[PDB]
C-alpha cells in the first residue's frame, strides 16, 4: 500500500517563524494529499486537500504545496495556537494512508517553574489513601527533575510524573508529580517537600506544606 | 451545520462484538461516504474503511487484523460499524469522519469514541480536590486542582468551571499503575479570588457514563 | 473490474470547446478513488429539469481507474439554444452553462 512518511516527528520552531512539515509517499499520489491538524484531546481538523487547497476556517498562514511524491505544509508566521500534531494523508487510492504525524513544538526563552504542593484530600484520607501532589508549571525547557523529600529524606517509591504538551498561551511545559502513600505512612510524618531541579535555577526550587 | 455524534466510549471483553454509531445531521446523509478511522493511543491514524451511505457500497482495509462491518441507516441518518472478535490490538479511539465531495479526505470528524478491549472491570475515578495547606499565603495567584485517581478504561474529560475570568488550566496525561489510570488537572486563578470563588472540576468518564463535580474547598 | 456511478465530484479542465461540428468537447478531472465508475453527465435544458435532452457523443463516459485525478474526455451534442452540462448529483453536482446558436 502507499506509505506516507513525514519529516522528523519532533520538530521545533519559534513563534512567528516559517516551518515546513514534509510528507513523502512511496509513489506518485498525483497531487492527492491532505493535511490534518490534531490538538490534544480533539478530533483531527482538515487543513489542506489536494496538496494546496486550503479548507475554510483555516488561516492563510497555512499553505500546502506538492505533487508527484513530495508534499509540504508550510505555516508562515507560526503561532502558539498552532501547537499540535500534524498528519498528511493520501487520497489517491485505497487503502487510504496517513503519515505518522509531526508534532509542532516551539523554541522560547527559559522560564522558572512555579511549584505548588498539595496535601491529600480530606476525601481520600477518609477512604484509606493518601496522595501528595506537586505541580511544576509554566517552565521551559521541558527538561526538569523533581524529587520528594519526607522529613528531609528523599523518597522515590510510589511517585508518578506526567508532563503536559506545550501550553498554547506561553508555550511552556508543566508537569504533575504524584506520590501515593498509605494513610498510616502519611500520618507518621511532618514535612513534605517537593524539589524541582531545572536549568533556570542553580539550586533546587522547592515548595512544602507541613502536617500529616 | 454538518455534525457527527458518535456512541459513547466502551469497555468490551476480548472476543466480544460491539457497534459504534455515527448520527449524521446538517447535510444530505446519502450523498457522502462516512469514513471510519482508527487510532490506537500511542499510534497514528489508520484507515479502517468507508461506506457510501447512499448505496451501501463498502470498502474495507482488508489487511487489518480486525473484523469490521459498515451499515448505513438512511432512515435515521446513522452510520454504524460492527467490530467482532475484539482484541487488545483493537483498543483505540475510533473516529467517524465524512468523506468530502472533492476526494477521499475527511472534512468533518466526530469526536471519536474510545474502545478498550479488556477483561478488566469498569472503574470510575475518585476525584480528589487539590488545595493548598496552611502557612503559605501564595503570591498574586493560587493554583488549585483535581486528582483523578484509579479508573479504567482510559479517556476522561476534566472541564473546569471557575468564577474568575482568569483560569489557566493544565491537564496532565494519564499514567497506568496497578491496572488503573491516574491523571490530574491544575487550574490557576487570582489569589484574591480564593477561597471565596467557586471553582469546580467536573470529571467525565464516558466509559462509565459518569461525571463527577468537585467543588474545591480550603484544605 | 467496474463499479457503480462515480460518487465524488468532478472538475472541468479549461472550458467546453466548440467542435465546429455541432458538438462540444470537454475534459473533466475526477477526484474519487471509487472507480472504475460511470460518469454522471448529461446535457439538460434547464437546471429546473435534469431530463437529458442533449446527447453524449462519447460512448458511456467512464473513469477507468481506481486512482484519483483521473481525467476523462467527453463530446456532447447539446440542444440548440440554452442548456447545461451537468456532472454528478446531490451535493456534489456541478454544471456549466452553454448556448448553441
XYZ file of N, CA and C in Angstrom, chain B:
657
model
N -25.643 22.727 9.789
C -24.240 22.522 10.247
C -23.914 21.038 10.240
N -22.943 20.655 9.427
C -22.554 19.255 9.348
C -21.964 18.808 10.675
N -22.543 17.772 11.267
C -22.022 17.245 12.517
C -22.247 15.741 12.684
N -21.320 15.105 13.394
C -21.366 13.667 13.625
C -21.316 13.309 15.114
N -22.411 12.753 15.621
C -22.472 12.371 17.019
C -22.291 10.856 17.155
N -21.149 10.445 17.699
C -20.829 9.027 17.872
C -21.323 8.459 19.196
N -21.351 7.132 19.304
C -21.782 6.490 20.540
C -20.678 6.694 21.570
N -21.007 6.532 22.847
C -20.011 6.733 23.886
C -18.938 5.661 24.001
N -17.815 6.023 24.622
C -16.709 5.094 24.822
C -17.238 3.847 25.515
N -16.516 2.740 25.380
C -16.947 1.493 25.995
C -15.814 0.517 26.261
N -15.999 -0.303 27.289
C -15.029 -1.321 27.664
C -15.692 -2.626 27.256
N -15.000 -3.425 26.450
C -15.551 -4.690 25.978
C -14.616 -5.849 26.288
N -15.199 -7.022 26.527
C -14.414 -8.212 26.816
C -13.767 -8.612 25.508
N -12.549 -9.157 25.560
C -11.931 -9.556 24.295
C -12.825 -10.647 23.696
N -12.900 -10.710 22.369
C -13.727 -11.722 21.733
C -15.145 -11.250 21.485
N -15.593 -10.297 22.298
C -16.935 -9.739 22.180
C -17.079 -8.944 20.891
N -18.298 -8.483 20.640
C -18.604 -7.717 19.443
C -19.287 -6.419 19.864
N -18.951 -5.319 19.204
C -19.545 -4.030 19.551
C -20.005 -3.245 18.334
N -20.881 -2.282 18.568
C -21.379 -1.469 17.482
C -21.218 0.001 17.817
N -20.425 0.718 17.024
C -20.271 2.156 17.227
C -21.260 2.829 16.275
N -21.972 3.830 16.769
C -22.930 4.530 15.934
C -22.381 5.896 15.560
N -22.894 6.428 14.461
C -22.492 7.737 13.990
C -23.695 8.409 13.347
N -24.334 9.293 14.110
C -25.508 10.014 13.638
C -25.121 11.286 12.899
N -25.485 11.345 11.625
C -25.180 12.495 10.783
C -26.364 13.450 10.661
N -26.079 14.739 10.768
C -27.111 15.746 10.623
C -26.465 16.961 9.983
N -27.285 17.838 9.420
C -26.751 19.038 8.799
C -26.359 18.910 7.336
N -26.621 17.752 6.733
C -26.289 17.541 5.327
C -27.014 16.326 4.763
N -26.992 16.189 3.440
C -27.637 15.061 2.778
C -26.839 13.786 3.036
N -27.270 13.065 4.066
C -26.648 11.825 4.511
C -26.201 10.915 3.377
N -27.140 10.566 2.504
C -26.870 9.657 1.400
C -25.870 10.094 0.324
N -25.584 11.388 0.195
C -24.650 11.800 -0.859
C -23.182 11.690 -0.492
N -22.885 11.172 0.692
C -21.496 11.085 1.101
C -21.021 9.744 1.606
N -19.708 9.665 1.774
C -19.065 8.475 2.285
C -18.702 8.792 3.720
N -18.984 7.864 4.624
C -18.603 8.044 6.016
C -17.340 7.198 6.170
N -16.283 7.801 6.702
C -15.026 7.092 6.894
C -14.932 6.640 8.329
N -14.229 5.537 8.541
C -14.012 5.031 9.872
C -12.503 4.982 10.053
N -11.998 5.843 10.928
C -10.569 5.905 11.169
C -10.210 5.444 12.563
N -9.172 4.624 12.632
C -8.718 4.094 13.899
C -7.439 4.787 14.341
N -7.266 4.897 15.654
C -6.064 5.486 16.222
C -5.803 4.913 17.607
N -4.898 3.942 17.667
C -4.518 3.333 18.933
C -3.716 4.414 19.657
N -4.005 4.631 20.951
C -3.369 5.627 21.823
C -1.982 6.153 21.448
N -0.990 5.277 21.397
C 0.337 5.750 21.060
C 0.630 5.808 19.573
N -0.297 5.301 18.768
C -0.118 5.258 17.321
C -0.661 6.457 16.550
N -0.548 6.380 15.226
C -1.041 7.442 14.371
C -2.430 7.101 13.861
N -2.740 7.552 12.651
C -4.042 7.304 12.048
C -4.032 6.217 10.980
N -4.978 5.291 11.079
C -5.100 4.241 10.083
C -6.548 4.084 9.610
N -6.697 3.996 8.297
C -7.993 3.866 7.645
C -8.628 2.489 7.821
N -9.814 2.443 8.409
C -10.481 1.161 8.596
C -11.326 0.803 7.371
N -11.882 1.830 6.740
C -12.715 1.635 5.571
C -13.800 2.688 5.575
N -14.637 2.684 4.547
C -15.720 3.647 4.465
C -16.949 3.002 3.853
N -18.034 3.763 3.794
C -19.279 3.271 3.234
C -20.062 4.407 2.592
N -20.497 4.193 1.356
C -21.271 5.201 0.640
C -22.714 5.088 1.139
N -23.032 5.882 2.152
C -24.345 5.874 2.770
C -25.521 5.818 1.799
N -25.352 6.400 0.620
C -26.431 6.399 -0.347
C -26.673 5.089 -1.071
N -25.644 4.261 -1.213
C -25.819 2.997 -1.918
C -25.487 1.791 -1.061
N -24.755 2.022 0.019
C -24.386 0.929 0.888
C -23.073 0.301 0.480
N -22.437 0.828 -0.565
C -21.165 0.265 -1.005
C -20.128 0.395 0.105
N -19.357 -0.661 0.318
C -18.341 -0.639 1.360
C -16.963 -0.967 0.826
N -15.960 -0.363 1.446
C -14.572 -0.596 1.096
C -13.849 -0.771 2.423
N -13.237 -1.934 2.599
C -12.527 -2.247 3.831
C -11.019 -2.347 3.653
N -10.285 -1.942 4.687
C -8.840 -2.059 4.664
C -8.667 -3.548 4.973
N -8.818 -4.357 3.930
C -8.716 -5.815 4.004
C -7.623 -6.363 4.930
N -6.444 -5.751 4.870
C -5.290 -6.184 5.650
C -5.327 -6.001 7.167
N -6.310 -5.285 7.688
C -6.341 -5.086 9.129
C -6.832 -6.278 9.921
N -6.063 -6.611 10.955
C -6.377 -7.720 11.842
C -7.553 -7.316 12.716
N -8.727 -7.240 12.097
C -9.960 -6.869 12.782
C -11.109 -7.096 11.817
N -12.238 -7.527 12.357
C -13.395 -7.798 11.534
C -14.392 -6.652 11.640
N -14.425 -5.821 10.600
C -15.307 -4.663 10.546
C -16.479 -4.834 9.589
N -17.569 -4.153 9.909
C -18.777 -4.198 9.104
C -19.451 -2.833 9.168
N -19.690 -2.241 8.005
C -20.332 -0.941 7.951
C -21.756 -1.083 7.450
N -22.661 -0.320 8.047
C -24.052 -0.301 7.633
C -24.491 1.142 7.732
N -25.412 1.543 6.869
C -25.906 2.911 6.892
C -27.422 2.883 6.957
N -27.956 3.466 8.022
C -29.392 3.530 8.215
C -29.836 4.900 7.729
N -30.191 4.967 6.453
C -30.620 6.211 5.834
C -31.918 6.750 6.438
N -32.592 5.920 7.225
C -33.832 6.334 7.863
C -33.532 7.232 9.043
N -32.496 6.876 9.796
C -32.093 7.650 10.957
C -30.857 8.491 10.637
N -30.329 8.343 9.422
C -29.127 9.072 9.017
C -28.031 8.746 10.026
N -27.753 7.458 10.161
C -26.742 6.998 11.093
C -25.909 5.918 10.425
N -24.599 6.010 10.610
C -23.681 5.037 10.048
C -23.182 4.223 11.229
N -23.131 2.914 11.067
C -22.659 2.076 12.143
C -21.453 1.287 11.716
N -20.708 0.828 12.709
C -19.553 -0.011 12.471
C -19.614 -1.130 13.488
N -19.675 -2.357 12.988
C -19.721 -3.527 13.844
C -18.319 -4.113 13.926
N -17.804 -4.262 15.143
C -16.473 -4.831 15.344
C -16.557 -6.106 16.174
N -16.342 -7.248 15.529
C -16.403 -8.530 16.218
C -15.017 -9.123 16.489
N -14.990 -10.151 17.341
C -13.761 -10.837 17.741
C -12.700 -9.829 18.193
N -13.077 -8.989 19.153
C -12.195 -7.954 19.684
C -10.924 -8.457 20.344
N -9.865 -7.667 20.192
C -8.546 -7.969 20.728
C -7.930 -6.732 21.375
N -6.910 -6.931 22.204
C -6.260 -5.805 22.850
C -5.680 -4.926 21.748
N -5.530 -5.511 20.563
C -4.989 -4.805 19.406
C -5.985 -3.778 18.872
N -7.271 -4.062 19.044
C -8.331 -3.171 18.574
C -8.653 -2.056 19.565
N -7.985 -2.047 20.712
C -8.239 -0.993 21.682
C -7.714 0.305 21.105
N -8.604 1.280 20.953
C -8.211 2.574 20.405
C -9.357 3.574 20.323
N -9.020 4.793 19.924
C -10.034 5.814 19.753
C -10.517 5.628 18.313
N -11.822 5.491 18.141
C -12.347 5.318 16.802
C -13.076 6.557 16.364
N -12.685 7.069 15.207
C -13.308 8.264 14.677
C -14.274 7.982 13.554
N -15.287 8.829 13.491
C -16.288 8.767 12.457
C -15.981 10.015 11.644
N -15.755 9.863 10.347
C -15.450 11.035 9.529
C -16.280 11.081 8.267
N -16.466 12.271 7.719
C -17.235 12.384 6.494
C -16.305 12.660 5.328
N -16.374 11.816 4.302
C -15.530 11.977 3.121
C -16.069 13.102 2.250
N -15.208 14.074 1.964
C -15.572 15.241 1.174
C -15.998 14.962 -0.261
N -16.802 15.863 -0.803
C -17.271 15.712 -2.167
C -16.108 15.690 -3.144
N -15.051 16.437 -2.826
C -13.888 16.542 -3.697
C -12.749 15.556 -3.492
N -13.022 14.424 -2.852
C -11.964 13.449 -2.662
C -12.044 12.627 -1.395
N -11.203 11.602 -1.318
C -11.192 10.732 -0.157
C -10.485 11.303 1.071
N -10.717 12.581 1.326
C -10.172 13.220 2.514
C -11.406 13.600 3.335
N -11.261 13.642 4.653
C -12.390 13.970 5.512
C -12.405 15.435 5.910
N -13.571 16.056 5.776
C -13.741 17.459 6.128
C -14.490 17.645 7.458
N -15.049 16.560 7.981
C -15.766 16.606 9.251
C -15.562 15.293 9.995
N -15.127 15.402 11.245
C -14.860 14.242 12.084
C -15.732 14.271 13.314
N -16.063 13.087 13.819
C -16.844 13.009 15.037
C -15.810 13.179 16.136
N -16.239 13.290 17.384
C -15.273 13.465 18.460
C -14.614 12.166 18.875
N -14.861 11.119 18.103
C -14.263 9.838 18.405
C -14.846 9.147 19.619
N -14.966 7.832 19.519
C -15.470 7.025 20.616
C -14.315 6.113 21.022
N -13.997 6.090 22.314
C -12.895 5.265 22.804
C -13.340 3.845 23.142
N -12.672 2.880 22.527
C -12.968 1.482 22.748
C -11.772 0.795 23.399
N -12.020 0.163 24.539
C -10.970 -0.533 25.261
C -11.343 -2.008 25.376
N -10.527 -2.862 24.769
C -10.764 -4.293 24.803
C -9.955 -4.838 25.963
N -10.652 -5.237 27.022
C -10.004 -5.761 28.216
C -10.992 -6.527 29.079
N -10.482 -7.527 29.792
C -11.300 -8.342 30.683
C -11.457 -7.649 32.042
N -10.832 -6.486 32.186
C -10.907 -5.730 33.426
C -12.262 -5.054 33.550
N -12.677 -4.788 34.780
C -13.949 -4.127 35.029
C -13.869 -2.593 35.062
N -14.941 -1.969 34.586
C -15.046 -0.520 34.528
C -14.978 0.104 35.911
N -14.023 1.004 36.104
C -13.879 1.669 37.389
C -13.891 3.169 37.187
N -14.876 3.862 37.772
C -14.889 5.315 37.600
C -13.724 5.820 38.459
N -13.317 7.087 38.295
C -12.201 7.548 39.117
C -12.630 8.304 40.367
N -11.744 8.352 41.349
C -12.034 9.118 42.546
C -11.500 10.487 42.170
N -12.305 11.516 42.362
C -11.856 12.846 42.037
C -11.539 13.504 43.354
N -10.253 13.739 43.583
C -9.815 14.356 44.817
C -9.458 15.808 44.583
N -9.919 16.700 45.470
C -9.610 18.119 45.314
C -8.167 18.421 45.728
N -7.562 19.399 45.065
C -6.200 19.797 45.366
C -6.179 21.255 45.791
N -6.009 21.462 47.095
C -5.966 22.797 47.673
C -4.759 22.936 48.584
N -4.180 24.143 48.643
C -3.007 24.483 49.456
C -3.163 24.149 50.947
N -2.032 23.928 51.620
C -2.033 23.603 53.039
C -2.454 24.745 53.948
N -1.553 25.204 54.817
C -1.868 26.293 55.747
C -1.012 27.553 55.594
N 0.192 27.528 56.162
C 1.080 28.680 56.095
C 1.856 28.847 54.796
N 1.252 29.546 53.837
C 1.879 29.776 52.539
C 1.537 31.134 51.927
N 0.307 31.599 52.156
C -0.168 32.877 51.615
C 0.484 33.186 50.266
N 0.297 32.267 49.322
C 0.844 32.374 47.974
C 0.805 33.796 47.414
N 1.577 34.029 46.354
C 1.653 35.346 45.739
C 0.387 35.943 45.149
N 0.494 36.424 43.916
C -0.634 37.038 43.229
C -1.605 36.016 42.650
N -1.197 34.755 42.602
C -2.073 33.732 42.064
C -1.989 32.434 42.850
N -3.126 31.766 43.009
C -3.145 30.493 43.714
C -3.497 29.406 42.697
N -2.789 28.287 42.764
C -3.035 27.178 41.860
C -3.754 26.060 42.599
N -4.872 25.618 42.042
C -5.644 24.546 42.651
C -5.697 23.432 41.629
N -6.431 22.372 41.953
C -6.543 21.271 41.021
C -7.386 20.097 41.478
N -7.386 19.052 40.656
C -8.120 17.831 40.925
C -7.279 16.639 40.519
N -7.277 15.624 41.371
C -6.544 14.404 41.103
C -7.602 13.360 40.765
N -7.558 12.867 39.531
C -8.496 11.859 39.044
C -7.741 10.542 39.192
N -8.045 9.806 40.257
C -7.326 8.574 40.543
C -8.055 7.227 40.466
N -7.307 6.216 40.026
C -7.793 4.850 39.934
C -9.003 4.551 39.078
N -8.888 4.754 37.770
C -10.010 4.495 36.884
C -9.637 3.634 35.678
N -10.659 3.108 35.007
C -10.455 2.255 33.841
C -11.786 2.047 33.137
N -11.788 2.035 31.794
C -10.647 2.206 30.891
C -10.266 3.677 30.847
N -9.375 4.060 29.939
C -8.994 5.459 29.893
C -9.888 6.398 29.089
N -9.430 7.650 29.055
C -10.089 8.776 28.444
C -11.119 9.330 29.435
N -10.784 10.467 30.024
C -11.686 11.151 30.927
C -11.554 12.602 30.516
N -12.578 13.392 30.783
C -12.504 14.787 30.411
C -12.693 15.639 31.639
N -11.735 16.527 31.867
C -11.773 17.412 33.005
C -12.019 18.829 32.540
N -13.250 19.279 32.717
C -13.611 20.629 32.350
C -13.768 21.388 33.667
N -13.072 22.512 33.770
C -13.115 23.328 34.966
C -14.115 24.452 34.825
N -14.797 24.748 35.923
C -15.766 25.824 35.945
C -15.317 26.783 37.050
N -14.944 28.000 36.673
C -14.493 28.980 37.660
C -15.333 30.256 37.631
N -15.204 31.060 38.683
C -15.941 32.303 38.770
C -15.077 33.445 38.279
N -13.767 33.230 38.286
C -12.812 34.237 37.835
C -12.581 34.095 36.338
N -12.492 35.223 35.640
C -12.254 35.207 34.202
C -10.864 34.644 33.919
N -9.994 34.686 34.919
C -8.653 34.140 34.764
C -8.633 32.749 35.373
N -8.281 31.767 34.554
C -8.192 30.375 34.987
C -7.312 29.683 33.969
N -6.029 29.547 34.258
C -5.164 28.859 33.316
C -5.131 27.396 33.757
N -5.645 26.508 32.913
C -5.668 25.101 33.267
C -4.632 24.268 32.519
N -4.086 23.284 33.222
C -3.109 22.373 32.657
C -3.651 20.989 32.923
N -3.800 20.208 31.868
C -4.282 18.855 32.024
C -3.097 17.925 31.789
N -2.827 17.067 32.762
C -1.706 16.152 32.667
C -2.131 14.758 32.235
N -1.511 14.234 31.172
C -1.841 12.902 30.667
C -1.887 11.830 31.753
N -2.719 10.821 31.534
C -2.869 9.740 32.493
C -1.699 8.771 32.431
N -1.505 8.026 33.514
C -0.434 7.042 33.584
C -0.990 5.801 34.255
N -0.609 4.629 33.754
C -1.080 3.382 34.337
C -0.285 3.026 35.573
N -0.943 2.350 36.503
C -0.302 1.917 37.735
C -1.247 0.955 38.436
N -0.840 -0.310 38.495
C -1.632 -1.356 39.129
C -2.923 -1.599 38.363
N -2.866 -1.418 37.047
C -4.040 -1.642 36.225
C -4.992 -0.465 36.170
N -4.702 0.567 36.952
C -5.548 1.738 36.971
C -4.846 2.980 36.454
N -5.624 3.817 35.772
C -5.150 5.075 35.211
C -5.309 6.201 36.221
N -4.279 7.024 36.345
C -4.368 8.156 37.240
C -3.991 9.367 36.423
N -4.647 10.476 36.720
C -4.421 11.695 35.980
C -4.835 12.886 36.822
N -4.428 14.076 36.410
C -4.779 15.277 37.146
C -4.900 16.497 36.231
N -5.439 17.573 36.783
C -5.582 18.817 36.055
C -5.340 19.925 37.072
N -4.689 20.998 36.646
C -4.455 22.112 37.546
C -5.099 23.332 36.927
N -5.479 24.264 37.781
C -6.100 25.486 37.332
C -5.535 26.553 38.248
N -5.105 27.657 37.655
C -4.530 28.746 38.425
C -5.453 29.943 38.312
N -5.660 30.634 39.430
C -6.536 31.801 39.452
C -5.986 32.909 40.349
N -6.603 34.103 40.306
C -6.118 35.196 41.153
C -6.257 34.836 42.643
N -5.186 35.035 43.409
C -5.179 34.741 44.845
C -6.337 35.397 45.595
N -6.657 36.620 45.193
C -7.738 37.400 45.779
C -9.092 36.709 45.643
N -9.204 35.815 44.671
C -10.460 35.132 44.420
C -10.665 33.817 45.158
N -9.622 33.314 45.809
C -9.770 32.065 46.547
C -9.514 32.249 48.039
N -10.250 31.513 48.886
C -11.283 30.532 48.533
C -12.696 31.094 48.459
N -12.835 32.376 48.147
C -14.162 32.974 48.073
C -14.932 32.568 46.815
N -14.239 32.319 45.708
C -14.948 31.930 44.490
C -15.196 30.434 44.441
N -16.099 30.037 43.555
C -16.431 28.639 43.391
C -15.728 28.075 42.171
N -14.779 27.188 42.425
C -14.006 26.555 41.371
C -14.244 25.065 41.440
N -14.808 24.507 40.377
C -15.068 23.081 40.368
C -14.606 22.416 39.082
N -14.122 21.187 39.228
C -13.673 20.394 38.103
C -14.713 19.291 37.926
N -15.351 19.259 36.770
C -16.327 18.218 36.511
C -15.556 17.179 35.715
N -15.509 15.967 36.245
C -14.767 14.888 35.630
C -15.680 13.899 34.932
N -15.597 13.884 33.607
C -16.404 12.987 32.795
C -15.637 11.722 32.401
N -16.258 10.574 32.651
C -15.677 9.283 32.311
C -16.718 8.616 31.407
N -16.657 8.883 30.088
C -17.629 8.284 29.170
C -17.841 6.788 29.375
N -16.746 6.039 29.438
C -16.824 4.593 29.621
C -17.766 4.155 30.752
N -17.865 4.941 31.821
C -18.742 4.565 32.925
C -20.016 5.402 32.961
N -20.209 6.220 31.930
C -21.395 7.066 31.833
C -21.534 8.005 33.036
N -20.404 8.365 33.638
C -20.412 9.233 34.802
C -19.718 10.572 34.638
N -20.043 11.463 35.559
C -19.474 12.786 35.581
C -19.545 13.252 37.018
N -18.376 13.472 37.612
C -18.294 13.919 38.991
C -17.894 15.378 39.110
N -18.671 16.121 39.884
C -18.402 17.528 40.091
C -17.702 17.757 41.419
N -16.501 18.318 41.365
C -15.757 18.586 42.582
C -15.577 20.068 42.842
N -16.239 20.561 43.878
C -16.089 21.955 44.242
C -14.858 21.956 45.128
N -13.908 22.830 44.836
C -12.708 22.878 45.648
C -12.998 23.562 46.981
N -12.446 22.999 48.048
C -12.642 23.543 49.382
C -11.283 23.795 50.013
N -11.184 24.808 50.891
C -9.916 25.127 51.561
C -9.458 23.933 52.403
N -8.260 23.421 52.127
C -7.745 22.269 52.866
C -7.006 22.638 54.151
